[PDB]
Amino acid sequence: RPHERLDAWRDSMELVEMIYRLTEVFPDQERYGLTAQLRRAAVSIPSNIAEGAARDYSRFLSIARGSLSELDTQVQIAARLGYSRSEDDQSVRRQVDLVFAKLTALMNALRRR
Amino acid sequence: AQRPHERLDAWRDSMELVEMIYRLTEVFPDQERYGLTAQLRRAAVSIPSNIAEGAARRSTPDYSRFLSIARGSLSELDTQVQIAARLGYSRSEDDQSVRRQVDLVFAKLTALMNALR
Amino acid sequence: RPHERLDAWRDSMELVEMIYRLTEVFPDQERYGLTAQLRRAAVSIPSNIAEGAARDYSRFLSIARGSLSELDTQVQIAARLGYSRSEDDQSVRRQVDLVFAKLTALMNAL
Amino acid sequence: RPHERLDAWRDSMELVEMIYRLTEVFPDQERYGLTAQLRRAAVSIPSNIAEGAARRSTPDYSRFLSIARGSLSELDTQVQIAARLGYSRSEDDQSVRRQVDLVFAKLTALMNALR
Amino acid sequence: PHERLDAWRDSMELVEMIYRLTEVFPDQERYGLTAQLRRAAVSIPSNIAEGAARRSTPDYSRFLSIARGSLSELDTQVQIAARLGYSRSEDDQSVRRQVDLVFAKLTALMNA
């Protein structure tokens, strides 16, 4: 499995775990709303990277980077709605920034070839 | 990240819509919590998420494809808001606030989809 | 908001309400469910007509007619399963038919 | 409605009713679910037949008829999944398979009937 | 028809594997990580079958790509379930090996 060696994949998978653990203490009203949306956005990041590294490769990473942004927007909504405490909001934000850096450095090296 | 979307009026206004829709829907009947309520929330959330997703894309055609998906979600959001008001789930006053926000978010999105041509 | 002047949207939304009434007495176990799917299909009709009038137009109308065909079959399954009042079914049928005509009318001035 | 006189639609509708009734013995927790997947696939078949028949365009009609047939094929796989998972009664699995073969033939004859 | 394809046959076995794996997941995840995982696996042979029953080759390729998307989403979902503690190691390995199998068979269809 080639993607499994990528920093971008490893750091994005760690992010996904953080999301699932964040959404556990969310209201139960929200299980199929924001929490299902956060989880679908997060899962899409490593999934798409993994798909890319099976190859066009750039297009898959572009999709992953869009999902990152969707996640980041939905994390902010969580914060604003009072579903997350600062300490956890900050942990996820930093991790999102980390995934962004690793993913664009990977996208950039692919474009240069 | 880099968050160019955070700069757009369409996004800031969308994000405000999310909070309003969440507010408005807290008073909806329990029988709708996973029905209409969950649908209004998802659709409202879907809008800024889709703006952000598009803005992160490489080409103009992709940006627009996602902005177009965002306006679609606004259109279903508005339909559901109106239906909730007809079934009498919403109080008339904040039902009016939501509608102005809907027109606004629509304007900002529309203007933007046209900046991309 | 040009769509609100259209007979098709007006009658769409009237159908959405008819579909809510029709399904409020559907079995509880079907709440998420046949009742949910019928409610989403309905909402889809006016939503797509709205998205249409703001513009491609012809294509959103085609999507609206799509959901109406899905609605119509689900309403008919519901009757066959015995979920709907025998007279409420025929009222919905007639409304489906009206929406269909109005959608087809507006879709034809293409 | 005009489409309600097509056998392919009538036999589709009977199939969809069979599928709703088939899922009513599935675990309550699979409601969202193979149960939802089966039903979505099923509903799609007569819905697309009816939509094709309303189009003036014959090739667009045929296209809709292809979608219906893709959905039927989707349905058949999902019915085989339900059986593999022990969700359905043998006889019901058998009744549904036979209805599926019947709708395949009827849809295919209709597709051909417009070359 | 598509039932003579290996990607289908092997997809179908993965579905049974994923249903069994999630049988022991926490009830609190029923609707859930469990449902999203089951929904993803079901979709793989479904899309193969739906694409294959389409006359057109463009549409066949488009369905096989969705199938592969869902396969990636399932794969990451399985590993997240592992990290959360929801599965036995032996069980996790078998599905991993099966995912590898469906992937190679899918890729060998998307090449024809």
UniProtKB/TrEMBL annotation, chain D:
Pfam families in the record: 23S_rRNA_IVP
The record ties this protein, via PANTHER family, to: FOUR HELIX BUNDLE PROTEIN
Report the protein name in the record: Four helix bundle protein
Q: Which organism is it from?
A: Xanthomonas campestris pv. campestris (strain ATCC 33913 / DSM 3586 / NCPPB 528 / LMG 568 / P 25)
In the record, what lineage is assigned to the organism producing the protein? Bacteria, Pseudomonadati, Pseudomonadota, Gammaproteobacteria, Lysobacterales
